[PDB]
Amino acid sequence: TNLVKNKCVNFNFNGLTGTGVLTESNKKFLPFQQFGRDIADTTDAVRDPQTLEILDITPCSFGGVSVITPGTNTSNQVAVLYQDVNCTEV
């Protein structure tokens, strides 16, 4: 299925499955290799089988919603803080 770049996608590569944000990446694999991995034994970076390229995997961002409010006494108005995102996914 056509590959998705810079957009949250479920995926399967060569049977490897996960969900992340696939990007272009400059880390450099030796020929025979398949995965990359991080310190945590997550699957960090994968290589596209059909067109060899080094694709990062960053699972889609998430964070705690924080409702900032004065006392409900003074107002009903809230200002929401989405923690640790770029402002798009709103």
Binding site: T17, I39, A40, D41
Partner: protein
């Protein structure tokens, strides 16, 4: 580089347990696999229920281990923080008469 070990130890132990806490995700805990979906993929749910328990029971426990560590470890820092706030108040802001409290 060893003068800062006190700080360096704090930062490490935090990043330490996190690594350990993460690596606990990859442990079977008696379940057939550490990937939560594989148990769902291979097995019909009615049995897979019992499997996922051993993951959950394992992992859910493994949090309480991590959480309890942080509580205990924070209670140390909480004690060290007061020692600073004591020095900061007495030593920096005032002049200390306490022998070898300020060094």
């Amino acid at each position: 580089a060893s003068a800062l070990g006190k700080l360096q130890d704090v930062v490490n132990q935090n990043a330490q347990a996190l690594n350990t806490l993460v690596k606990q995700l990859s442990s079977n805990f008696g379940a057939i696999s550490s990937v939560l979906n594989d148990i769902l993929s291979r097995l019909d749910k009615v049995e897979a229920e019992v499997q996922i328990d051993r993951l959950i029971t394992g992992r859910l426990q493994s949090l309480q281990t991590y959480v309890t560590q942080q509580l205990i470890r924070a209670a140390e820092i909480r004690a060290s923080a007061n020692l600073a706030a004591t020095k900061m108040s007495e030593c920096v802001l005032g002049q200390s008469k306490r022998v070898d409290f300020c060094g």
